[PDB]
Design a protein around this ligand. Structure first.
Ligand SMILES: CCCCCCCCCCCCCCCCCC(=O)OC[C@H](COP(=O)([O-])OCC[N+](C)(C)C)OC(=O)CCCCCCCCCCCCCCCCC
Ligand SMILES: CCCCCCCCCCCCCCCCCC(=O)OC[C@H](COP(=O)([O-])OCC[N+](C)(C)C)OC(=O)CCCCCCCCCCCCCCCCC
Ligand SMILES: CCCCCCCCCCCCCCCCCC(=O)OC[C@H](COP(=O)([O-])OCC[N+](C)(C)C)OC(=O)CCCCCCCCCCCCCCCCC
Ligand SMILES: CCCCCCCCCCCCCCCCCC(=O)OC[C@H](COP(=O)([O-])OCC[N+](C)(C)C)OC(=O)CCCCCCCCCCCCCCCCC
Ligand SMILES: CCCCCCCCCCCCCCCCCC(=O)OC[C@H](COP(=O)(O)OCCN)OC(=O)CCCCCCCCCCCCCCCCC
Ligand SMILES: CCCCCCCCCCCCCCCCCC(=O)OC[C@H](COP(=O)(O)OCCN)OC(=O)CCCCCCCCCCCCCCCCC
Ligand SMILES: CCCCCCCCCCCCCCCCCC(=O)OC[C@H](COP(=O)(O)OCCN)OC(=O)CCCCCCCCCCCCCCCCC
Ligand SMILES: CCCCCCCCCCCCCCCCCC(=O)OC[C@H](COP(=O)(O)OCCN)OC(=O)CCCCCCCCCCCCCCCCC
Ligand SMILES: CCCCCCCCCCCCCCCCCC(=O)OC[C@H](COP(=O)(O)OCCN)OC(=O)CCCCCCCCCCCCCCCCC
Ligand SMILES: CCCCCCCCCCCCCCCCCC(=O)OC[C@H](COP(=O)(O)OCCN)OC(=O)CCCCCCCCCCCCCCCCC
Ligand SMILES: CCCCCCCCCCCCCCCCCC(=O)OC[C@H](COP(=O)(O)OCCN)OC(=O)CCCCCCCCCCCCCCCCC
Ligand SMILES: CCCCCCCCCCCCCC
Ligand SMILES: CCCCCCCCCCCCCC
Ligand SMILES: CCCCCCCCCCCC
Ligand SMILES: CCCCCCCC
Lengths: 56, 341, 62, 48, 106, 100, 48, 55, 115, 446
């Protein structure tokens, strides 16, 4: 099928809002949540007994 | 060599002139050795029953005579300014010496004579052109400590010798473009370690000297002559075509070892970017090696019907299969070697 | 089913012979003057046979 | 319609490990006022 | 063909098993030996060998040592899990002037 | 252990792994003690099992203080660096969870 | 992904090899003139 | 019922290779005899070297 | 050893016993390579594989002799290499000094926690 | 592992003796039997002899590779009856088994790299020699170049690590740690392409559809596990750069596996749908590796072994129906229950194994790899639930549309199932349901 594919703004828009854009927002959400939780964890705002996911 | 004892005499004066060149402690003795080597190599490569061999000899003559006169010119200028045989600090006349040596060696961007002349040759004179005639200019490059000009030559040689070999379906010009690509790996090793260059040159000449014998015996001057080449067992053609994966640098063959020692010595000397540029180059060289390897890896071919028996020389095919064994199972001799310590 | 039974029947005979006729080991305290061997840390006689004869010790690998 | 329940049970198992054993019957009455255990119960409720 | 052929089938006409389609003798050896070296050896005798494997990974010994360390630590005032890797008197504790600006990670 | 020594880092890493295993069935045995308290005191597990739950929570807190956040590749070096950084933090900034 | 990958890389390398094959279609005097120009460049900077 | 015919006599050569590999493993066990009893976890102190080695 | 002296690091005390394959691996591998090369020659000329055993015996003897000779040359090359390294360390003791061994009890590295 | 390697090295001359195909299969299953009796390995490196040794990780990977190659000889009978270079095929299988054992038994990383690149050549030989379509040349070139383009700068990374540390041994390299971005990208991108990330998968369905079953099983069952075992070795000393740069790979490998799972719902080729099924579950493996939790590594190794077994078993079924129906698709192979009723039991027992099957090792690998992703962040819950829901949406469509409904009514008469095929399907499924009784040998490699 690839030999009938041309760079067109419809195909670029399909490849943008289909694949790249959910990857971008999902990576941004993961980075923002982990940065906030890492700042909370490294500042010292939570204790060792009141901490989620102790693997125990 | 073939059909005359005077060609054996020309080979003797060829070895004498090259060994006069590389042993010279002055640029003038190296220059006159290049004159002896040129004198020896004009009559081999000349044949009056071939219309293109004389044109190839003329192209070689004009390229080497222009490159030898520039080499003597900048040698005389180096003696004029810095009166010893070498130079204390690097200047432009050392770059002119290196450029005149790069025209002899066939590296890019002075590469253009080399595959345009290799269409006019046989296979044995091709092997003498791209192995022994690269002894004398490459060993004289070692006396010059220039990094930018050598680095430009390395990058241009590995870019062009990979890209340029895709278009030609003739095996002589394709193998000439492969020799341009393997010249860049030699020149990249020339400014880190002369011994590692000698090892890459010896194994490259070994793989060239075993790939010439498959083409010289059966007279394979084209890509589809490989597809029409008759063997009495298709497993034999499958094994004989593994030397192209060896020359492509694929482990566990023998030709992974010299590329690997160049990569190890380059990374110890803290060069990483041009090494990465030479990683992308050798994939394209392995790609146009695989178009030869189409002729044996599919195990069954629509072949021509009239030919039924294959013919070969006795001593040439006996010496060919000693080295084809060592071009496949040559990594079992990794414990025997002691140069690399 | 033939080859499963042809496997299981000597396995069942060996397991019954080990569990009935040679028996398991009994736990006991280590004597002060005795250094135990590498197969004496295991309860079952099949495990003792496997550790003593077939498998290497943990000390040798360590 | 059963696979949604299967993956809700998978996420409940993934949350249940804060206190070690997935045998919930020894922890439900202890942790009826814990946010992680209500989220376990919500995933189990979605699966059921 | 007739109904007497089907009622009394021929030994020489054999439905071939999956291994060899040339000789009937080669199937009746390959099926037996391939079922011996896979089902009997690897999946029954190998599973019996694995069932009575020793504690190569220390798990039963770790359970026994867990009961013994809970036996000794409940006898004394030492807590059941030690919070520290070593004793804090062996910790050198470099001063704040010696550290300067160094990243401290918890 | 020294920096360049590898014969003793193996022994220290192996005893660190074995102590991690020993503390793992310490916490596992304490959890089974709490569960057996729950089954045996079937209508009255809110009174009898509260001290056992207190020892289990203290054991989980001490286990996370010693072994927590090290990851899959927990050497004896990594737990010692964790303990040094934790003792530095309780020297300077006070106990973990108070602030600063 | 095939536009940023293997098939379009093959098309680009085939176009570059077709262009570089036209570089080799001239006589030897063009390349020797290029070498003479490069030597003249290195000799002008010897004055400078 | 086994299915090994007269061509199964070729299989003594891989068992010979098994014996060769086992002999080389035993020779490498003999080569690694340093720290046989000097390890801090399984090694008895001095004055008790008269007993047999453990492996 | 409380210090890492390069002289004590490079001097062969003799506690490293060589392996079983250490004196014998190169001649048997080169003999196997010679026998396989003669087999490969006989296969490409459409002979039987074990037809000419004179070539097999000659190639094996050439392989064993070359393997033993180049193994000896390798051993003297490595001995001279370590002698060169030792003599260069004793020639310039200022650039290769005696460094004090520093335990982990005096080192504060940065541990990397996952969470 | 000298006894196994010398066993296969003297199993090499059985290829040149005629009518010995099943004898090589019998002795390779004997190798698997002996390697079942060699289990005594723990965490560190045991059975050390001439740079060769294994831990529990490498023990399970060698055992999986030995089981897959013996099954591969059992799977490939079309080589035997047509005499389609069975000696060369047997020699390729034995040499590739030596190379995979040698790249798994490596105590230093450079033997792993060297035999890892050596293992690309007999797989390329299998692709270029024993396929059935004209796009064999498109397949092995994609495999070779997508592996080599990222595996060549990792050699520069290896020599950079060697100069910095001075050795390639996996325990001595565990002590150090590096804060270089390009070293991280070299040591990761080769494993990120070799086991398929969503952005770099391309070579996988091209290599799988074209490849012969003895050539698709070694790409599905193993040789994607080289790119997982490489990260299981490499992420130990690059933890800080992994915490800097994990989130882009976790986001890509969790969006893929949903997009990849939606791809399989819109495809008709039977071999291509399992080819994309290898991407989605090892998307879970790749997401669980780069979270450095202990459960993540243990469940990742479990899902590597179990997913290799079930994917090789699923590619076993796609060649049984291919050789009877001439060409495979969803449209031709619709409803094979009325043709082969006894094959349908293995069809469901291995297609259910591709999703969460209840007593198999696939579920136990999946139930502990979800633990690390959920404990990593709560944002990942949304794109995991869609991932597993669409995973069992596509992998039940395979069995559903191929094994139920009206017949094609255009097919000709073909042979029925044989003793070889049911035995081949049994040894892919019952190891998935029997190694759960000792799952600690496939969970705990640490
Ligand atoms: C990948 C390559 C796989 C090749 C084939 C392997 C076949 C052998 C599998 C052996 C696993 C096994 O079952 O071990 C016995 C297992 C392992 O023995 P185990 O009891 O010591 O298990 C390990 C210990 N625990 C229980 C803590 C996990 O035996 C049992 O579980 C006992 C009951 C066996 C019979 C159960 C009913 C069968 C019908
Ligand atoms: C793959 C084919 C190419 C592999 C090349 C390297 C193989 C290993 C080797 O030769 O190591 C040398 C080392 C040599 O080290 P050594 O410890 O024997 O030391 C002797 C070294 N000299 C003689 C120089 C003093 O071999 C070994 O350590 C043991 C090798 C055992 C046999 C391995 C066979 C592998 C076959 C693979 C087929 C596919
Ligand atoms: C292409 C881009 C190549 C960039 C090369 C940069 C190398 C570098 O930084 O070296 C110096 C540094 C040198 O580190 P250093 O710490 O030794 O620095 C020495 C500093 N002096 C000289 C002052 C003493 O290398 C590194 O930091 C490690 C780099 C290792 C890898 C080198 C090759 C990188 C290739 C990138 C490949 C990416 C994968 C995807 C490929 C896709 C196809 C292209
Ligand atoms: C006839 C054979 C009888 C065998 C026998 O006695 O077995 C007894 C044994 C138990 O006795 P046992 O474990 O004490 O026996 C083995 C003892 N040693 C190790 C000393 C040899 O097995 C069983 O009862 C079978 C239990 C099967 C459980 C399957 C669990 C599957 C879970 C799947 C979901 C979770 C996934 C995550
Ligand atoms: C191989 C074939 C081709 C493949 C193509 C597809 C590739 C997919 C993979 C993409 C890789 C990741 C790209 C970046 C993701 C986000 C990274 C990140 O963490 O961004 C955080 C940053 C924060 O933004 P800021 O406001 O500066 O922060 C305040 C904080 N207190 O946020 C930002 O910086 C947000 C702004 C940048 C967003 C970029 C989105 C690009 C979308 C496509 C564009 C295409 C060209 C037009
Ligand atoms: C070391 C060097 C070895 C070779 C020495 C050769 C010396 C003579 C060179 C020469 O020119 O000899 C003339 C002739 C050679 O043959 P020629 O006629 O040149 O070629 C015809 C085929 N193209 O030669 C003859 O006609 C003489 C017969 C052959 C040479 C015999 C003597 C040299 C033997 C070696
Ligand atoms: C400094 C940074 C250097 C970056 C180098 C990156 C190299 C990437 C190599 C990957 C493969 C690329 C192959 C390729 O594209 O080859 C074709 C290329 C251009 O093709 P061209 O003939 O220009 O076609 C245009 C008309 N169709 O090439 C050719 O056809 C011939 C080569 C022309 C360009 C040469 C560039 C040389 C760069 C030298 C750098 C020197 C650095 C030190 C300087 C002091
Ligand atoms: C009926 C048809 C099928 C029959 C199948 C029979 C199988 C019998 C069992 C074979 C199990 C072999 C498992 C194995 O690898 O055992 C290794 C073991 C090593 O023994 P060793 O190291 O001496 O032990 C003392 C150390 N504590 O033991 C050995 O190495 C001993 C066996 C050596 C075999 C040599 C063959 C030539
Ligand atoms: C991101 C990854 C980018 C590279 C992807 C892998 C490259 C590859 O495999 O290209 C395939 C190509 C042969 O293409 P093929 O499919 O045989 O032909 C289709 C007909 N138009 O083969 C080639 O292009 C071979 C040369 C690859 C060179 C790669 C390094 C320089 C850039
Ligand atoms: C000792 C085992 C060493 C294993 C190492 C790999 C050996 C690879 C095979 C070498 C021998 C060979 O090529 O044998 C081929 C030959 C085929 O038989 P053929 O003559 O075609 O037909 C029989 C009816 N006339 O086969 C036969 O005739 C059967 C031969 C059985 C014994 C094989 C080994 C004998 C030779 C000594 C070792 C040679 C090792 C060469 C290694 C090359 C690669 C490094
Ligand atoms: C990877 C593969 C490397 C090359 C392998 C070449 C041999 C492959 C093979 O199995 O060939 C079988 C073949 C059958 O014989 P054929 O040539 O068809 O005609 C009979 C005439 N004697 O030919 C033979 O049986 C000839 C046997 C002698 C030639 C091979 C000698 C050994 C080659 C290395 C074996 C070990 C591989 C590395 C470990
Ligand atoms: C004195 C007690 C003897 C017990 C013997 C038990 C033998 C068990 C053998 C297990 C391994 C079998 C491998 C085929
Ligand atoms: C085909 C067999 C070749 C090898 C024969 C044995 C050679 C032994 C090594 C060479 C002699 C070493 C003396 C120290
Ligand atoms: C056809 C006869 C096969 C058995 C005799 C020849 C092979 C002997 C091998 C001996 C290995 C030790
Ligand atoms: C590779 C070695 C083969 C010969 C071993 C002999 C042992 C006595």
């Amino acid at each position: 099928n690839y030999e009938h594919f041309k760079p067109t703004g419809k195909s670029f828009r399909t490849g943008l809002f289909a694949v790249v854009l959910p990857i971008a927002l999902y990576a941004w959400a993961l980075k923002a949540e982990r940065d906030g939780r890492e700042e909370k964890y490294r500042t010292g705002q939570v204790a060792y007994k009141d901490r989620q996911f102790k693997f125990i | 060599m073939f059909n005359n004892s005077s060609k054996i005499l020309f080979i003797t004066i060829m070895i004498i002139g090259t060994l006069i060149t590389v042993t010279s402690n002055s640029w003038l003795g190296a220059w006159m050795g290049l004159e002896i080597n040129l004198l020896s190599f004009i009559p081999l490569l000349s044949d009056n029953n071939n219309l293109m061999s004389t044109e190839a000899s003329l192209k070689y003559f004009l390229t080497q005579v222009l490159a030898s006169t520039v080499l003597l010119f900048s040698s005389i200028l180096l003696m004029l300014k810095n009166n010893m045989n070498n130079e204390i600090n690097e200047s432009f006349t050392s770059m002119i010496i290196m450029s005149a040596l790069l025209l002899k060696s066939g590296a890019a961007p002075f590469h253009f004579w080399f595959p345009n002349m290799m269409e006019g040759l046989t296979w044995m004179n091709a092997l003498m052109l791209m192995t022994w005639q690269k002894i004398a200019p490459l060993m004289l490059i070692s006396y010059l400590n220039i990094k930018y000009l050598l680095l430009i030559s390395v990058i241009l040689s590995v870019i062009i010798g990979a890209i340029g070999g895709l278009n030609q379906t003739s095996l002589r010009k394709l193998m000439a473009f492969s020799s341009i690509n393997h010249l860049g790996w030699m020149l990249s090793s020339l400014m880190i370690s002369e011994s590692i260059w000698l090892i890459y040159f010896f194994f490259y000449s070994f793989l060239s000297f075993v790939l010439t014998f498959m083409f010289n015996i059966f007279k394979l001057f084209h890509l589809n002559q490989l597809f029409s080449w008759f063997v009495n067992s298709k497993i034999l053609k499958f094994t004989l075509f593994m030397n192209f994966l060896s020359l492509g640098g694929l482990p566990p063959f023998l030709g992974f070892l010299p590329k690997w020692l160049v990569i190890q010595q380059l990374t110890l000397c803290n060069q990483y970017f041009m090494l990465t540029l030479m990683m992308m180059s050798t994939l394209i060289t392995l790609f146009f090696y695989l178009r030869i390897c189409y002729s044996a890896f599919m195990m069954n071919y629509f072949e021509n019907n009239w030919i039924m028996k294959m013919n070969m020389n006795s001593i040439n095919y006996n010496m060919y299969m000693i080295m084809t064994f060592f071009s496949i199972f040559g990594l079992f001799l990794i414990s025997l070697f002691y140069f690399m310590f | 089913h033939f080859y499963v039974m042809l496997g299981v029947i000597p396995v069942t005979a060996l397991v019954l012979y080990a569990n009935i006729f040679v028996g398991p080991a009994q736990l006991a305290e280590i004597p002060e003057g005795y250094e135990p061997k590498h197969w004496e840390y295991e309860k079952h006689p099949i495990s003792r046979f496997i550790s003593r004869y077939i498998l290497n010790s943990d000390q040798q690998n360590y | 319609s059963n696979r949604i329940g299967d993956v809700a049970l998978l996420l409940s198992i993934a949350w249940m490990l804060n206190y070690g054993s997935w045998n919930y019957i020894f922890y439900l009455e202890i942790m009826q006022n814990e946010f992680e255990m209500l989220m376990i119960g919500s995933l189990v409720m979605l699966a059921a | 063909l007739t109904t007497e052929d089907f009622a009394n089938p021929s030994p020489k006409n054999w439905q071939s098993y999956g291994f060899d389609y040339k000789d009937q003798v080669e199937d009746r050896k390959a099926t037996k030996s391939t079922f011996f070296v896979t089902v009997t050896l690897c999946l029954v005798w190998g599973s019996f060998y694995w069932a009575y494997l020793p504690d190569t990974q220390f798990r039963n010994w770790a359970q026994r040592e867990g009961f013994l360390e809970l036996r000794r630590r409940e006898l004394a005032g030492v807590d059941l899990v030690s919070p520290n890797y070593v004793d804090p008197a062996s910790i050198t504790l470099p001063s704040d002037e010696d550290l300067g600006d160094t990243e401290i990670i918890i | 252990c020294y920096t360049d020594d590898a014969v003793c880092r193996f022994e220290a890493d192996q005893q660190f792994r074995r102590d991690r295993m020993v503390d793992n069935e310490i916490v596992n045995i304490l959890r089974q003690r709490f569960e057996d308290c729950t089954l045996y005191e079937a209508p009255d597990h809110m009174v009898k099992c509260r001290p056992l739950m207190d020892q289990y929570e203290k054991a989980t807190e001490n286990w996370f203080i010693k072994y927590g956040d090290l990851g899959g590749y927990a050497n004896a070096k990594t737990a010692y660096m964790k303990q040094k950084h934790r003792l530095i933090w309780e020297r300077r900034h006070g106990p973990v969870g108070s602030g600063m | 992904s095939e536009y940023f990958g293997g098939q379009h890389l093959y098309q680009k390398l085939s176009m570059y090899s077709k262009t570089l094959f036209l570089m080799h279609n001239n006589s030897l005097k063009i390349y020797l003139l290029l070498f003479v120009f490069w030597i003249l460049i290195l000799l002008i900077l010897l004055f400078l | 019922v086994l299915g090994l015919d007269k061509r199964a006599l070729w299989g003594a050569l891989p068992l010979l290779g098994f014996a060769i590999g086992h002999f080389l493993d035993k020779k490498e066990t003999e080569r690694m005899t340093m720290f046989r009893d000097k390890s801090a976890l399984y090694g008895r102190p001095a004055g008790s070297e008269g007993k047999a080695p453990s492996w | 050893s409380a210090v890492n002296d390069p002289l004590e690091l490079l001097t062969n005390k003799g506690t490293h016993e060589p392996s079983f394959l250490s004196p014998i691996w190169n001649p048997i591998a080169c003999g196997v390579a010679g026998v396989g090369a003669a087999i490969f020659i006989n296969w490409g000329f459409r002979k039987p594989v074990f037809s000419g055993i004179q070539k097999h015996i000659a190639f094996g003897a050439i392989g064993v002799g070359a393997g033993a000779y180049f193994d000896q040359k390798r051993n003297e090359y490595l001995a001279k290499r370590d002698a060169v390294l030792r003599h260069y360390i004793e020639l310039h003791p200022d650039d290769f000094p005696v460094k004090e061994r520093k335990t982990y009890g005096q080192v504060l590295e940065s541990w990397v926690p996952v969470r | 592992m000298l006894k196994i390697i010398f066993f296969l090295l003297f199993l090499i001359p059985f290829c040149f003796i005629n009518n010995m195909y099943w004898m090589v299969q019998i002795m390779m299953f004997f190798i698997s039997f002996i390697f079942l009796l060699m289990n005594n390995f723990m965490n560190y490196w045991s059975e050390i002899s001439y740079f060769l040794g294994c831990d529990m990780l490498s023990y399970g990977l060698i055992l999986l590779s030995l089981w897959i190659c013996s099954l591969m000889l059992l799977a490939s009978e079309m080589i035997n009856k047509h005499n389609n270079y069975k000696n060369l095929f047997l020699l390729n299988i034995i040499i590739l088994l030596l190379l995979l054992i040698l790249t798994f038994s490596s105590m230093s990383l450079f033997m792993f790299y060297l035999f890892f690149e050596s293992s690309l050549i007999p797989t390329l030989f299998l692709i270029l020699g024993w396929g059935y379509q004209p796009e064999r040349l498109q397949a092995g070139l994609y495999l070779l170049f997508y592996t080599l383009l990222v595996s060549l700068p990792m050699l520069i990374g290896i020599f950079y690590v060697m100069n910095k540390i001075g050795s390639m041994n996996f325990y001595l390299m565990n002590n150090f740690m590096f804060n270089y971005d390009l070293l991280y990208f070299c040591l990761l991108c080769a494993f990120l392409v070799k086991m398929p990330m969503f952005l770099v998968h391309l070579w996988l369905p091209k290599a799988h559809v074209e490849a012969p079953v003895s050539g698709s099983m070694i790409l599905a069952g193993i040789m994607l596990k080289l790119g997982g075992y490489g990260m299981l070795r490499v992420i130990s000393f690059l933890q800080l750069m992994n915490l800097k740069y994990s989130f882009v790979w976790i986001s890509i490998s969790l969006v893929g596996g949903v997009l990849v799972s939606l791809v399989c719902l819109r495809q008709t080729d039977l071999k291509a749908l399992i080819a994309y099924s290898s991407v989605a579950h090892m998307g879970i493996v790749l997401s669980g590796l780069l979270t450095m939790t202990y459960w993540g590594l243990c469940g990742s190794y479990t899902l590597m072994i179990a997913h290799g077994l079930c994917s090789s078993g699923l590619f076993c079924l796609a060649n049984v129906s291919y050789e009877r129906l001439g060409s495979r698709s969803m449209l031709i192979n619709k409803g094979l229950l009325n043709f082969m009723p006894s094959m349908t039991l293995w069809w469901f027992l291995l297609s259910s194994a591709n999703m969460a099957a209840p007593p198999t090792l696939n579920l136990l690998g999946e139930i502990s790899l979800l633990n690390s992703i959920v404990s990593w962040s709560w944002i990942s819950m949304i794109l995991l639930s869609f991932l597993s829901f669409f995973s069992a949406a596509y992998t039940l469509y395979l069995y559903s549309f191929s094994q139920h409904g009206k017949l094609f009514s255009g097919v000709y008469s073909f042979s029925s199932g044989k003793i070889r095929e049911y035995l081949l399907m049994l040894l892919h499924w019952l190891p998935l349901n029997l190694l759960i009784l000792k799952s600690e040998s496939f969970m705990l490699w640490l």
